[PDB]
Specification:
Oligomer: part of a larger assembly
Chains A, B, C, D: M17 leucyl aminopeptidase
Radius of gyration of chain A: 25 Å
Bound molecules: {(R)-amino[4-(1H-pyrazol-1-yl)phenyl]methyl}phosphonic acid, zinc ion
CATH superfamily of the largest domain in chain A: Zn peptidases
Number of strands of chain A: 20
CATH class of the largest domain in chain A: Alpha Beta
Entry title: Phosphonic Arginine Mimetics as Inhibitors of the M17 Aminopeptidases from Plasmodium falciparum
Largest interface: B-C, 35 and 37 residues
Keywords: Aminopeptidase, Leucyl aminopeptidase, Protease, HYDROLASE-HYDROLASE INHIBITOR complex
Organism of A, B, C, D: Plasmodium falciparum 3D7
PDB class: hydrolase/hydrolase inhibitor
Amino acid sequence: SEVPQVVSLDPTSIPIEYNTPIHDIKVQVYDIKGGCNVEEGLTIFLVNNPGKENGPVKISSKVNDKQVSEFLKDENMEKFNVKLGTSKHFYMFNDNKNSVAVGYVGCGSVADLSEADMKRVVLSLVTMLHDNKLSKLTVVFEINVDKNLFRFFLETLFYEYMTDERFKSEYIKHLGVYINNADTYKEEVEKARVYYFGTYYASQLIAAPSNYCNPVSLSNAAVELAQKLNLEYKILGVKELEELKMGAYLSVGKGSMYPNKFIHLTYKSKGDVKKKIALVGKGITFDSGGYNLKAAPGSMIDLMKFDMSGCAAVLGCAYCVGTLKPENVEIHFLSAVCENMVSKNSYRPGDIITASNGKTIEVGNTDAEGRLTLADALVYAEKLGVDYIVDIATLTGAMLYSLGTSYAGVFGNNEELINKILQSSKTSNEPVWWLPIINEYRATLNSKYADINQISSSVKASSIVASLFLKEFVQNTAWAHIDIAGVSWNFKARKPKGFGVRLLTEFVLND
Amino acid sequence: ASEVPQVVSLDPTSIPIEYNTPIHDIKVQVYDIKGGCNVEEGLTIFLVNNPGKENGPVKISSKVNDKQVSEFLKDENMEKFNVKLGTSKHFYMFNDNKNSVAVGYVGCGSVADLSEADMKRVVLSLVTMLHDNKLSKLTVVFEINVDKNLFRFFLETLFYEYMTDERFKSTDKNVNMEYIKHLGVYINNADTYKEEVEKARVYYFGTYYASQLIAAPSNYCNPVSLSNAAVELAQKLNLEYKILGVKELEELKMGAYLSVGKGSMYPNKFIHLTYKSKGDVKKKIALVGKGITFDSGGYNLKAAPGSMIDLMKFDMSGCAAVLGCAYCVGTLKPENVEIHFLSAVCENMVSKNSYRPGDIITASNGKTIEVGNTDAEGRLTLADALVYAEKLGVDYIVDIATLTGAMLYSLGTSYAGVFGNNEELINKILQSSKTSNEPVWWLPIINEYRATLNSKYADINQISSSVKASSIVASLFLKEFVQNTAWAHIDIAGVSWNFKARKPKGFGVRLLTEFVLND
Amino acid sequence: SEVPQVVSLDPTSIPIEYNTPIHDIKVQVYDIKGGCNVEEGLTIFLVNNPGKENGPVKISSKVNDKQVSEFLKDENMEKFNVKLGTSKHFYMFNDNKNSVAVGYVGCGSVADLSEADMKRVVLSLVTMLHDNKLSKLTVVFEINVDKNLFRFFLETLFYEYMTDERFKSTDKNVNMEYIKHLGVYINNADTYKEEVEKARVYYFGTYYASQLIAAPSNYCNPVSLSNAAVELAQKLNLEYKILGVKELEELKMGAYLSVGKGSMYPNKFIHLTYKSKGDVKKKIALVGKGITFDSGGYNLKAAPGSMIDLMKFDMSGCAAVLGCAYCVGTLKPENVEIHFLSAVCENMVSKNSYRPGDIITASNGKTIEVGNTDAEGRLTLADALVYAEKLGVDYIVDIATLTGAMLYSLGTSYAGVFGNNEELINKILQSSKTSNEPVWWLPIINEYRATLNSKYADINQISSSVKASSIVASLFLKEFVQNTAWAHIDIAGVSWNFKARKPKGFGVRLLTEFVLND
Amino acid sequence: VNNPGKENGPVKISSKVNDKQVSEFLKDENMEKFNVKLGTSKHFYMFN
Ligand SMILES: N[C@@H](c1ccc(-n2cccn2)cc1)P(=O)(O)O
Ligand SMILES: N[C@@H](c1ccc(-n2cccn2)cc1)P(=O)(O)O
Ligand SMILES: N[C@@H](c1ccc(-n2cccn2)cc1)P(=O)(O)O
Ligand SMILES: [Zn+2]
Ligand SMILES: [Zn+2]
Ligand SMILES: [Zn+2]
Ligand SMILES: [Zn+2]
Ligand SMILES: [Zn+2]
Ligand SMILES: [Zn+2]
């Protein structure tokens, strides 16, 4: 498990932060009926105006401080508006002559916030936290959210508040929440904190550049994670991968100085097993394209450290599952990890390679490497004899032109499973849309020489074609495929989303 | 009608349209298989499968009312052939009356319920047997299971694919072109299937009519000639009609639609056809089709590799499907409905008179629009068509358009995408997709992208600056022009043209008609 | 007739120079065995040294002056070599105590100079004429050349020497002075004497063509070019007619008319005729592609390498045909009837332009599906070929800047010839030899014909699958000649001299030699 | 089989065939229903 180096200055591990300052925040949830106390730090009102305009801010909650309550009177507050994400905050002295900050974030005019909207709310709030030295934040909900959305608020807050400074060379210690029917929201708090970290852990792996995060260091990190969670683990090396005849997966890695590593973590519930699941993540630690090099305008080769986002989501999910400890489920966490590089040793456009199920594949484009690695992972996953196989992958850039940057696409061979994923999208608030596997396009994968083509020459619906290819490697097991090529990276914030950790955990939990 | 302007005298002044096609001379007779099959003149084709047995052997199960033919078609003789989807074989023999007969089969594979795609492969194989063989009659024996809709779909597709469009042929007409006069069909429970026959013939012609308008090049089919054809159609069907000209469009302040047509030598013409049932009207529907008779891109000229400027006569496919639907509706005469058939027809050209990238134009609902790309012209014309539609006071607005090339990257060439603001209406569309066998998939209008249409100067941007999901952004733009009516949008940019066969599909005619009929 | 203008500063004619300085040159040929007189101006010896690479200059001619003869002794000349294209200037006094200038141009080792080699020699000589104000040049041939190559020397010398200042205003060359006399010393001079005025005629045909080509598309548009052609016909007493739009409509030339639809200039079809006074034994139609500017139309020339700034040259074929009309009309061959044809128009972007996808109808009734508006040349030629065949001629030869693909097949030196008749093709190759305008036979590959099959129209203008566009274009044109020997000369690669930044006037001499020899 | 002169003309088989059933299949009246366009084919199964 020694990471090879070219020079002594090359890093030999991924730095990982486990103990984050988010974990130090004491959280308290209070009912809003008893009035709000404003004694310290920053207090923010989440305010809308239905009908409205953008109408005026009007505060409805009772505040147990004379000076603040004066500040918050309708005549002052109408000077401001509830346009989504708009905020104002002011420092003042309270009834005990102590310095208090008080303000609001506008939640617009609709009464049901979408995940997108709520995200805009949190971002405004985070901007104030990053701009202010505070011991404590207090948030009071003057809008209605359900339990899942409340938890989404917390996760998004923690995640966005946290700043990754691992490669560079003050946080609040308390969070108060005022909300109607407080007691029903309390269970969401620590769940949010677990969901935050699984997501942030995924992010750290994705953000970690390819010199740091390579097939050896990523599998080392996965082992260290399993050890900390008491998960069973197994890392398959080149020799075993050859014995298993994983020729599609091995071919992708031929050109890399980093030997292929296959990750297999296993969680088992205490109880009687009622569902066995294999979660398979695409783990290309750097996708240069291979001989089909990413040289075309817009191919974004500098982003391609993110091509192990699927693997990160699966690993982050492992954190959440290993921590929350759901019952009656056995989960396998799989990733065929490798690096797609240019070398005398690389596989070539046109090569015919042989998958572990015996299928010969003609490589039409070395930059369609993910589906080759996934083919062998899927064969491996099916041999585990599980009930559901779900794979998640940054597989096709075409997703940007279908669903874009907000919704991932799910494709599958089984409507019941697909529907379970859509439900988990609803409760996780990571949005997914069901796209079809159109069988009429299957003929385009008929190779003249091999059993099957890797790519289509004629069909531009590449996300569907890739799904048709993948489907050839699952024979008799319910399977779904989540393409996160569009959603994984947050282009505007210049960072990963850690997309899919919460989706997969909800999937596991809801079962 | 209006006079079509010409640059030279040899410029065509109308679209050639074939109404009385050879398919309409075909006499169809349907028999129940339980009565046995008579095997006489022409070509008798058995549709045969073998469930579960992939590439399984052919077995003819139907009673054949001829001793020679029954002997020929017995299991031992047929076992050398297999049912592989699309395969076919011709047989020759003498019957009990000493007349030579031609017989054969088309293989329908080993899966019992044929998809719409599978059935098309079967039909294409059948058509291959009709081509280059001068036959007076074809007889088809169904030894596979099909529901009523799939039976109709077989007939529609057969009629459509058999037909050959020679309107623009002159020196190269097919000397050997000769159609059957009779079509016999044997099927179990024949009486239940009979009602589908004329329905299929009507659906075939609506689709083929749309196909004719689309395949017609932009010199033949321009906004004046296309609106003229809509008038002629309306007169033949006794639909009400109104064609709005520029002066009337100006009065209605349709600035977004008018701006697109500024650079064309052909004046904008807005088609408005109306069917009204004689009964008491229970539902009112507007069907809106994109009617760009040629899309050069305008100043944002289609010059990039893969922009397929030579295909762009097809950018009135949406208008064509709405008109094809008008044919079907006006022919079948549904009760209790009032249907408006709408198209803002124009041509997107490069000229001293063209609108420019950056121009700010005002739609008929007062919204100002910043033009970011003159090649996103469809959504601008649809904006004003949607405002016009909503003022009619209908229950549903459905538009259909070759709107975004991105469709090819999302759903590809077989499935159209539907988007909308109302779930009930979307499900009705999806239901019509099932019964018409023209596949459509529901795609989301993702509100998070809406902010990317915020203009610094105008009320709204025509295009997104940052979002590449253009089919979704376009849908977001269109939604701004429907205020309080259930509305759905069908993007057929990917499915309209059959690239393999080098012809249009007339996609959407049957879909839209089923939608009207089922309601 | 009247050229339309957008503003009053728009030109309404092509400026044309007919009486050139070359025409003022008095040429005298003398037999070299009488010895050479060296009395004034510049006297240049053309010398080689067969079989000795970069061999020494040796002057073998007798020079009728003691002082000059001494100067050019082998001893004095041995320091110089005959490397092809090298040259030297000498200065001395002759017997008359007069200042005299002498030099040489090396013609290498091979005793048989190629077309390319001879142009190298002529270019070196012109370098000696430029930037030196001389009243007289004398050339002494100490190399062997046949009659066609001697004529080629003069034609090339005249053409290269001539500088086109029609569009110069504030930047004319103040030092521009042309010799008034040219003396030529050659062995067996009597046989070469008849080549001189032939060379002058050939030079002007070529120069005339180049003037038309070089003239930009604002000056040279379909009206002004057809106007020029009438003027030329009047000067030569050729019969002429220009067919205008209404006549073109009556003749149903729908392919040709569609290309011009987008232009502010009306289509003009040029038809000049030369007819011998004797019995007519051969009738010939010469067809020249005449696109005065090719923007590409809606298939706009926007791709890198499309060279839109060069497209004033897309009437190079018409220009070659008109230059041939000048030569034929001047030299007056017997036994022949020649029709000089061009369907002239401009390919532009407009509300009025034809579109990609349009189906149009040619004058022979064939419907054509336009796959690319930038393949306009073959549409205009289609109707011109139909017109040509209706004249009842023995041969139709077209010449056109038809396909950029020529750059990748033959390049900038050799034109391609395609045809439906081996005898006609061979006559063109033979004319290539005697005109020294190089041409190579390329095949019309019938296997590609199916790629022109259209789903809706009788035929496709362009291929869907085949990249060999010069072949595809020829297949298309062939569909418009029914039963007449026809050949097609694609000059897209050779028409413009990219290094010298000017047209060659390619094809005038080739076409004239074809007519003359037949 | 070809048909000189007649573009896409009918198929006519000239060879004598030593089978009565096949001889009858190959008669002009049957074959004229097909054409000689380059690459076009038809074949039929029968008993001899
Ligand atoms: N790694 C896949 C991928 C993922 C995302 C993008 N991409 C995301 C945004 C723009 N391009 C491109 C390729 P692949 O190269 O299709 O294997
Ligand atoms: N006419 C629309 C369109 C439709 C289809 C295609 N297209 C269909 C297939 C490939 N490209 C491109 C543009 P538009 O240019 O987006 O308005
Ligand atoms: N005018 C023809 C042409 C001729 C020459 C070149 N060309 C010559 C050199 C580089 N490009 C390009 C187009 P066309 O655009 O094929 O009609
Ligand atoms: Zn790749
Ligand atoms: Zn990848
Ligand atoms: Zn467009
Ligand atoms: Zn369009
Ligand atoms: Zn061109
Ligand atoms: Zn040209």
